[PDB]
Design an enzyme around this catalytic site. Structure first.
Site, PDB file in Angstrom:
ATOM      1  N   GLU A   4      -5.570 -14.139 -16.437  1.00  0.00           N
ATOM      2  CA  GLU A   4      -5.883 -13.638 -16.937  1.00  0.00           C
ATOM      3  C   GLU A   4      -5.930 -12.641 -16.148  1.00  0.00           C
ATOM      4  OE1 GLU A   4      -9.532 -16.193 -15.370  1.00  0.00           O
ATOM      5  OE2 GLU A   4      -9.266 -16.924 -17.420  1.00  0.00           O
ATOM      6  N   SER A  24     -16.130 -19.728 -15.908  1.00  0.00           N
ATOM      7  CA  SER A  24     -16.447 -19.728 -16.823  1.00  0.00           C
ATOM      8  C   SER A  24     -16.470 -21.347 -17.309  1.00  0.00           C
ATOM      9  CB  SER A  24     -15.087 -19.292 -17.800  1.00  0.00           C
ATOM     10  OG  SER A  24     -14.540 -18.673 -16.827  1.00  0.00           O
ATOM     11  N   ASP A  33     -13.680 -16.746 -21.200  1.00  0.00           N
ATOM     12  CA  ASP A  33     -12.631 -16.231 -19.547  1.00  0.00           C
ATOM     13  C   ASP A  33     -12.957 -14.913 -19.753  1.00  0.00           C
ATOM     14  OD1 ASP A  33     -11.206 -19.048 -19.000  1.00  0.00           O
ATOM     15  OD2 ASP A  33     -10.343 -19.360 -20.393  1.00  0.00           O
ATOM     16  N   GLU A  46     -11.006 -16.751 -24.825  1.00  0.00           N
ATOM     17  CA  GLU A  46     -10.169 -17.743 -23.933  1.00  0.00           C
ATOM     18  C   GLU A  46      -8.692 -17.577 -23.749  1.00  0.00           C
ATOM     19  OE1 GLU A  46     -11.610 -21.026 -23.178  1.00  0.00           O
ATOM     20  OE2 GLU A  46     -13.673 -18.995 -23.170  1.00  0.00           O
TER      21      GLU A  46
END
Ligand SMILES: [Cl-]
Ligand SMILES: [Cl-]
Lengths: 123, 113
Positions: A4, A24, A33, A46
């Site tokens: 991420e 999340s 996310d 996501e």
């Protein structure tokens, strides 16, 4: 979550201000996310990393993403990273509905957008 | 700040807490029309002091994201109050919300519509 953070760097490079979402899955409300925006386009993402295809996503996770995107005013995307591949972005329309859930297999993956295209879509 | 999230959703915003190399607020919210980038503060009493760096970072994120930059301040026994950055009192090197600024604060209903 390492991944991420890498996507955040790519988003900022592509002209988006982007944040990772704290808790999340650990919250009562629909959550993606990452959320990102560049003043014109807003994204609810996501974020998935896999060693190989296919990527499976549950109906519930996609429903949650779509519901958050609708409420926030953002476009719902799945970002998928494979080894030795740049991040690829799949608008939720592009996900395959199969066996009551969703999938990105070899017939869908090649159609995924690169981040630069996601921005240009607006025009 | 989790109480604030609930207040935001109740008022019709989809809101998230923000989890670094880049500028970032505490909460980002949207309702499709208005987007908010919010620095969240809870204090026992005024004034609230904010650094120039914090406000600058909030404004830069808001400009980049396409959101309105706000400070949300909660005092004991008071509803959350929202202050656009232009409401802030500018001191020598900092920003401030004192007794004279606090009355200007919006309530969540006003921020939405
Ligand atoms: Cl993953
Ligand atoms: Cl590629």
């Amino acid at each position: 979550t390492r991944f991420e953070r890498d996507l955040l760097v790519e988003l900022w490079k592509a002209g988006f201000a982007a944040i990772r979402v704290a808790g999340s899955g650990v919250s009562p409300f629909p959550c993606p996310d990452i959320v990102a925006g560049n003043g014109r386009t807003y994204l609810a993402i996501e974020v998935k990393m896999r060693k190989e295809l296919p990527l499976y996503l549950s109906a519930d996770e996609v429903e949650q993403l779509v519901t958050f995107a609708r409420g926030f005013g953002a476009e719902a995307y799945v970002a998928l990273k494979l080894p030795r591949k740049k991040w690829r972005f799949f608008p939720v329309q592009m996900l395959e509905r199969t066996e009551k859930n969703f999938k990105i297999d070899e017939s869908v993956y090649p159609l995924g957008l690169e981040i630069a295209e996601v921005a240009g879509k607006f025009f």
